[PDB]
């Protein structure tokens, strides 16, 4: 009961993460890039631990955005792997991998890595 | 005594790794890209565990190549983080990060990730 993940999350660079955490471990919702128009909206699906440790630091989760919508297609997918931490300083700490489909895999610009911190309010 | 790391290693895509493991934990030598001419040769420096576990699977190491030589400059650096495993199927298992200097860090094409397996003979 009561995951605290459902709702709107903001990264530090203007992007928005709108998710519902279902009883079952499902994550669904919409990733909106910093441009924040119709073109900037992408489906996200993932999973989370619906029964985290009571001692633990957080709730493991991950999700995927394939960078294709009704408006445009960047022929790529990002996965975020991270942990929800609750409290008045609620956070989703993530690391991400961006893979491009087009790129020969063991060439330049195949897979990018970085990190994102999500908070309940913008910076 | 006797690290088994000193010598020539080949990745699966035509690149060459020529290293000396000093008594002290130093790695020094030359990374040669698949083109295998003068232009393709870069300094490498790193470190390794000069006293690995006797039970253990392997010898932790890492090294850096900054992609600048007398001939050309790709304004970037790769680090390989991995483990030497000895035996008749000797191997260096690595994962790598390639960072470009020029690129705004939290933009597209800042940091690439991949993996390389090094063996004592080419594929």
């Amino acid at each position: 009961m009561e995951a605290g993940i459902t709702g709107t999350w903001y990264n530090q660079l203007g992007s928005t993460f709108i998710v519902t955490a279902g009883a079952d471990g499902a994550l669904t919702g919409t990733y909106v890039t910093a441009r924040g128009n119709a073109e900037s909206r992408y489906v996200l699906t993932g999973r989370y631990d619906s029964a985290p440790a009571t001692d633990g630091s957080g709730t493991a989760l991950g999700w995927t955005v394939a960078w294709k919508n009704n408006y445009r297609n960047a022929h790529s997918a990002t996965t975020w792997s991270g942990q929800y931490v609750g409290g008045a300083e609620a956070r989703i700490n993530t690391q991400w991998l961006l893979t491009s489909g087009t790129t020969e895999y063991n060439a330049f610009m195949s897979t990018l890595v970085g990190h994102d911190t999500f908070t309940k309010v913008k910076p | 005594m006797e690290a088994g790391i000193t010598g020539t290693w080949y990745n699966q895509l035509g690149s060459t790794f020529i290293v000396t493991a000093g008594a002290d934990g130093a790695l020094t030598g030359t990374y040669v890209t698949a083109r295998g001419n003068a232009e393709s040769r870069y300094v490498l420096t790193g470190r390794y565990d000069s006293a690995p576990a006797t039970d253990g699977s392997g010898t932790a190491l890492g090294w850096t190549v900054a992609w600048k030589n007398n001939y050309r400059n790709a304004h970037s650096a790769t680090t390989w983080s991995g483990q030497y495993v000895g035996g008749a199927e000797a191997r260096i298992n690595t994962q790598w990060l390639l960072t470009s200097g020029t690129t705004e860090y939290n933009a597209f094409m800042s940091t690439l990730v991949g993996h390389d397996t090094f063996t004592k003979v080419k594929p």
Binding site: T33, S40, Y42, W67, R72, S76, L98 | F108
Partner: peptide, 8 residues
């Protein structure tokens, strides 16, 4: 060059 994840 460009990608929506990093757009300003």
């Amino acid at each position: 060059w460009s990608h929506p994840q990093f757009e300003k």
